[PDB]
Write an enzyme that holds these catalytic residues in place. Structure first.
Site: not given
Ligand SMILES: NC(=O)C1=CN([C@@H]2O[C@H](COP(=O)(O)OP(=O)(O)OC[C@H]3O[C@@H](n4cnc5c(N)ncnc54)[C@H](O)[C@@H]3O)[C@@H](O)[C@H]2O)C=CC1
Ligand SMILES: [Cl-]
Ligand SMILES: [Cl-]
Ligand SMILES: [Cl-]
Ligand SMILES: [Cl-]
Ligand SMILES: [Cl-]
Ligand SMILES: [Cl-]
Ligand SMILES: [Cl-]
Ligand SMILES: [Cl-]
Ligand SMILES: [Cl-]
Ligand SMILES: [Cl-]
Ligand SMILES: [Cl-]
Ligand SMILES: [Cl-]
Ligand SMILES: [Yb+3]
Ligand SMILES: [Yb+3]
Ligand SMILES: [Yb+3]
Ligand SMILES: [Yb+3]
Ligand SMILES: [Yb+3]
Ligand SMILES: [Yb+3]
Ligand SMILES: [Yb+3]
Ligand SMILES: [Yb+3]
Lengths: 493, 493, 493, 493
Positions: D159, D185, D218, D261-262, D295, D345, D392-393
């Site tokens: 998650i 996790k 992770g 899901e990305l 997302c 980032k 993706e910011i």
């Protein structure tokens, strides 16, 4: 088995329309009796055509486009149903006591079976509300096509006296989950549990007019439902005769959708290889449950010759173990029949059994100085042209028959206008599958009997009914399918 | 548009039972006419109660457990249907000519629309046969529960004269794919295409008794179907009056399952923002297709005031462009009405329009010295209490009405006992969705009209019918659900 | 069993892209052999990364919005598939001969089983094309929500050599029915039937680029598929090792969807009450079909002690009845293995059986002076740590084992990383149901083995694969679900 | 908006296996921070490979045939889920406070959105448990074929930190409803809400080992999940990079099922006819919700030239209205970013925007002396090769772009490896339908944005993920289909 530790007090005795209590337009009331004592319990407002018209107008209004019932989230319909189930669970002691007292139903069954089945079925139905989906369809041509599974509209629901609370929930559960509004007519014998549930519908928060309950008589309040010009659908459980009247009145009036459940003369076929004790137990409970007053009563038991005499003997020993009396007293295991009509019909059919030459193994007469009691009764060497083999008795009266040919016994099982259920008892895979396939019945049990759950569709072949109730299937009879087809410039798969 | 390059010769004129041709038990025959000439075309055997009994016994026998129709693979039922579709495709010229001659249907439509729809629908139905599935169900308790979606049994199917071949295929396609046997009664006006298809059923290889076709009259052969004690289901397309008779006869006899499709008074709502030319074209074709003899005829057109006069003018110019005559001659664009009853009914309704004060824009009378021809007719300023706004005309007669309030016009669209279809013409997403949702109709078209495909369920709200035909849904009305519940020692998810 | 009455002439030997034949970009060709003679049959163009890139661009272009494959009716995709099935049926003699010659497959099986299964599966898939439907969904809030079940896009499909034609159709059938475009890589051993079918794809009328076929090698043409950045999905049947490589390459490249079918070590459990002859026959055919070269090979047979010695004896007598030779000669009942790699692997595993102490009952060595033949071989008293009990042999090599405890034997059946299929042989209902539920396998057969039909989903538990092929389920892996949610002013149920 | 009227006290900080709290095998703990203050909140046990092995063994044991989770009624799984939802509703104040404090999430959103979505989704999932059904299938030959939709087994669920509670429930809800056991996790950043829910799982009555929660890192605890040999399935929401690692590790280990899901780079297309204010509002909330840490962030907004300058101006005025600060203080409308990595980032990407020549309209730098705050930032005249248009910011950073050609802008919307969602703003029916069909995205919103409900499947096209979560569809990824095919003497439809 907990009990109500304070005497039951009857409170709701009026007609329920738009979430308020109404007296009959005529001002008339009718009596309600306890079947175990033949004593009056209270008076209830008597609804007729004029009150049905009022309930229908309320239901119609609650169903209008833009109303709170039509515009709330499906998940919120589901939530209302879940809440109703929790309220019924809260009033379980009370409702089970009321059911038993008014219905002649054994308290332990009322509490452990009926009330539990009411609660579970509502929760099952709550879960479907936001899971009713239409389709998108790859029609020929440059169109976008979808379907909506909309509610039908105002549903009239006529309930019988044998399972007043279960049957109320089997009707309103799906109807409401799908988004319909309902006008319910409980049986004249048993209006009381329904009106208590109406108090819980109000307390749960259902918008007014979504559920309306009009106690009254059949040829009055029921016929006004079946012939009404603004009722979209009628659902009915009860006698074949009335089923035919309902279907006829529907056709004459406004071609309303009709679904029926009409009882049966359900057969069991016990093969020589069966676990015999298991078959005797389930066939026994199949016919004697709730004083024989079940639509699925296992009322013709065909047993292969080689085990037939053992089957009969074990069956008789089991039937001889009952204690008759008031369904409220612990240890009592057989209550009364619901009323005089049913009582007379059962005695008459028992008499025809004796006269037509069936072998009487036990029981065969009435019991007690008050209450509509019948002794549990077993007939062996029943043959297929006898009244007790052909007519639904709806009493504690078991018929046991012999066979030696399997093709022959399947024809005999099927040779009936009924088709509600059947039982097959065998250890052999092939026979279980091929027999169950050949039987003309809506539910077939293998090595058990009377197993009914919210997850399974339930209904008749032939004159035992049309349509199905419960399971995923049941929800279909409570929607109306609309196709919407939209012209587009160009489609792409 | 190819044509039959040899005169049509009529060959099949008898009753079709068990894949052979039978004379009527009575020996009686009835005449069949061409509507464009009023000339007799041939005599056909007249079936009655006694012939229906024979067809039903054959169907019943073809449906017995162990028979070839019950035991063949579902994929092979599908194959038979596919083969029938290929045979119909082979005899397309012939069947389209026969349809046109007997039915008064324009040859170009018979060939390009009807026959194509017959072929496509059969192929669609062929595809479902081995894709009809039941369920396995996670019932409470230690049981294994599954359902079978079995065929119902013997289905009686009564077809009308407006689309004799399409409607034959819409009935037998699903019925057969699901595994039923059928007794078909074609319309007395139009038995001929049905009997040619029966020759193709035999040639395809369907087992005998699976399809039986009993030409004859309604109150004779149709009433014997509807009242028959061994027919499990009746499907019917036709008039409301007869629909009510069918439903009543079903209830009186054996509580057979009933599905009806009963016509309509279908409305279109044309909003001010609509593509006007598109709306005029589709509404026009909506009402005038096949001489107005469509159940879904767009017979009330409500147009917003600000575009109403333009709508009326364009509509009249379009209606003025027809060429009446024999439906076989190329260039002819309007054929006759089917017969005298229908012809009289249309003239009478046109007269009532004039008398009640509608504005006549064109047509308004008969045409020619033979054939049941009616001039295409347009009425503007129609109002809601007129007969032409309330009654299904079933002729080439367009009604055009005004509105200025959208809430109001939706109530007017819904204020009918009919509910077959409707059309909405707008460019706005929200209105398309919210109007289509509020309309009480089985199919709603958005920016088009009359789009009907095998992939979509089709049927009425209200008195326009019950049940659905075609799409995945249609197949449901042709199965009977059986639950089988098996006791097991221990279940595991 | 008809035969080709003229010598087979090989014609299609090139790469098929955009419905035309292309030479390899490199100009290289590879040889193709007959396994029964070890003789070269022809040369075929060798496709590599550069040719895969060309096939993928063609597939991508055929899938663009607005293209003929994306805009044609779903029913017309279905029609193309049906037509392909009819063409395959036309060239059945030829294809079955080609399959047998190139694949080492017995001609009678190639003709009666493979080709029949190809035809039936295509027709099954043709039927689904216009029956793939999305949903309309009663979402919370004032929205209209629907889903589209769109095709995924360009699907790369890598096929093995054991069932070249069946597996080609199992892949392209569903893919195409759902609307995808495909790039197929046949096994290097067996490219020939695939390229003949490509000629039939062109002749049927499929738009160019919808199906592309790139014969070639695995680590070249297959790895270029699995690692390609514009392939949306890869489907693969074959070895576990390569399955792992495919899944890894997918993850490294573009996270393409992956489905695998990877063989097995499928167990049967034969209980003491089983019909013994039926169990011996089906277990035998389970392991020896197509020279053991089946993914579902019944390669561990556990038999209850009390019938074990009888089972072994009957099994050995059956294994001793084969005639080895050229799969084209009638009366020949066992062909060769596909090639040297497979041949070596089988001999090595047989040797390990002998060395690890299994009891050899028959066979155990090679056969003949040419062709990759292995004697049918039976091992009894196999135990679970032996290589022949753990590793997929993919040859004619039967393992037979003993058990006395049912809980124990279910753990032994499950104690494997494989999970493709299993068989249970018993007459008892409860055991059939509870054993089948406890087995960790994708298909469980009861009282039979190897029954595979287009109507059933087929695929592995565990390392035997992921996803399902065929049945309604299979079509799901070939769609991508899109939700469209539209704001509206007010929703109504 | 009620609040916790007593300071939050953190209590559950250990590893949850078999319904008890365990220290890490290593004895190590890791810190957990508040993002708004950069202060440590507590220490949590650090789980690694050895603890994952323990959780997996517990999950495996809870899933064994015969266990309480495998044998309880499906309706009782549903009941446990319903009860968990009621417990979460009980602890709503607490959980929303905990979510806000640990997650940097605005309290009003945590309470009104996240917690509400958690509760609703659980209740939705509760409803499916006893409505998951397999099929009965009319296979060719004399067989009875059914499927079971069994649970898959032990599911590992990883998650992310952006929606810790919603995502926990989206994973365990379906998994559990279908009957799986899980090893969860949570993100290292946000373990705390998960462990409180574990206390509620125990209190609800779930059998031990059904849910296990292993907080940790992770590359340690997550990689041990993804590579584990006894985990049947892994579900993951998070970065693309890790998605690729998960899919690779799955392929290398045991070919476990994988769903991802990305995230995305989701586009909106605003046509000239759009309601402009509605489009500005929804696009704004689309990109700025939860500090851009969604997302589905609407991170490329294409606006037709003629309304572009108005769109930009209105968008900037809206972005200028925020109040940054601690997400617990009422009136605060923008919280911090989750941590330093994400913060760096976002600043870097903003810088690249300035350097590559985008027009800066507001924001563009950090804010405050503590907490990971970024000013809401708007860029106009963004073009497609800039980093802010491609990457993706995951911060509050809106990109606004111009178009004049509709074909062109659809290609630009699609020209990305992402494919999670998209928005279309238009009043025209045809464009809404044809644009939504052409967009390569899992969810397309029309005239709204960010509408996500339990009833709809949710997931990516392309590299935005595979599989679907929620709706009816989502439940499919949590079952394994087994076909059982039983030999019978004779089948009958
Ligand atoms: N829904 C539709 O598509 C159709 C609607 N209609 C409507 O009904 C009106 C009357 O036309 P008719 O041709 O008299 O239709 P009808 O409903 O009487 O005839 C249709 C079919 O029903 C049969 N039938 C007639 N009486 C019957 C009975 N008592 N029992 C069983 N079957 C019977 C006829 O033989 C024919 O096969 C038309 O003007 C039109 O408005 C007529 C034909 C088709
Ligand atoms: Cl009565
Ligand atoms: Cl009465
Ligand atoms: Cl009476
Ligand atoms: Cl009539
Ligand atoms: Cl008439
Ligand atoms: Cl008449
Ligand atoms: Cl390899
Ligand atoms: Cl290799
Ligand atoms: Cl290799
Ligand atoms: Cl990382
Ligand atoms: Cl990291
Ligand atoms: Cl990192
Ligand atoms: Yb009565
Ligand atoms: Yb008495
Ligand atoms: Yb008539
Ligand atoms: Yb005349
Ligand atoms: Yb290899
Ligand atoms: Yb050799
Ligand atoms: Yb990371
Ligand atoms: Yb700092």
């Amino acid at each position: 088995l907990p009990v109500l530790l304070t005497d039951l007090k009857i409170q709701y005795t009026k007609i329920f329309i738009n979430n308020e209590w109404h007296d009959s337009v005529s001002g008339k009331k009718f009596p309600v009796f306890n079947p175990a004592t033949e004593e009056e319990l209270c008076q209830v407002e008597e609804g007729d055509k004029e009150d049905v018209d009022k309930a229908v107008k309320a239901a119609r209004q609650a169903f209008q486009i833009g109303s709170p019932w039509r515009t709330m989230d499906a998940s919120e319909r589901g939530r209302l149903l879940y809440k109703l189930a929790d309220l019924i669970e809260r009033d379980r002691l009370l409702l089970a006591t009321m059911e038993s007292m008014n219905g002649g139903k054994l308290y332990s069954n009322a509490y452990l079976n009926d009330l539990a089945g009411c609660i579970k079925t509502l929760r099952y139905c709550a879960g479907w509300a936001d899971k009713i989906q239409g389709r998108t369809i790859p029609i020929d041509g440059n169109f976008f096509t979808y379907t909506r599974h909309e509610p039908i509209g105002v549903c009239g629901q006529i309930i019988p006296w044998n399972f007043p609370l279960v049957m109320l929930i089997w009707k309103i559960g799906p109807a409401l989950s799908c988004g319909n509004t309902v006008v319910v007519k409980p049986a004249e014998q048993t209006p009381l549990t329904a009106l208590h549930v109406a108090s819980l519908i109000k307390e749960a928060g259902f918008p007014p007019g979504v559920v309306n309950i009009v106690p009254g008589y059949g040829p009055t309040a029921g016929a006004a439902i079946s012939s009404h010009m603004d009722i979209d659908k009628v659902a009915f459980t009860g006698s074949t005769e009335v089923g035919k009247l309902i279907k006829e009145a529907a056709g004459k009036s406004n071609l309303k959708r009709v679904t029926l459940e009409l009882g049966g003369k359900s057969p069991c076929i016990v093969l020589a290889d069966a676990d015999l004790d298991n078959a005797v137990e389930f066939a026994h409970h199949g016919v004697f449950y709730h004083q024989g007053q079940c639509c699925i009563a296992a009322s013709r038991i065909f047993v292969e010759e080689s085990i037939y005499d053992e089957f009969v003997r074990r069956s008789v020993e089991r039937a001889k173990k009952y204690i008759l009396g008031n369904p409220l007293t612990p240890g009592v295991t057989q209550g009364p029949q619901i009323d005089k009509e049913q009582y007379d019909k059962i005695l008459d059919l028992i008499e025809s059994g004796k006269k037509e030459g069936a072998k009487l193994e036990c029981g065969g007469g009435p019991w007690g100085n008050k209450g509509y009691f019948v002794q549990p009764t077993v007939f062996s060497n029943v043959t297929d042209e006898m009244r007790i083999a052909k007519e639904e008795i709806f009493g504690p009266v078991q018929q046991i028959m012999k066979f030696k040919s399997l093709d022959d016994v399947i024809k005999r099982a099927n040779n009936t206008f009924y088709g509600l259920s059947a039982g097959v008892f065998t250890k052999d895979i092939d026979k279980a599958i091929t027999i169950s396939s050949a039987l003309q019945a809506g539910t077939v049990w293998v090595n058990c009997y009377g197993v009914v759950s919210a997850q399974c569709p339930f209904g008749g072949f032939k004159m035992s009914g049309n349509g199905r109730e419960l399971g995923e299937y049941g929800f279909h009879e409570y929607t109306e399918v609309k196709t919407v087809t939209v012209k587009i410039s160009q489609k792409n798969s």
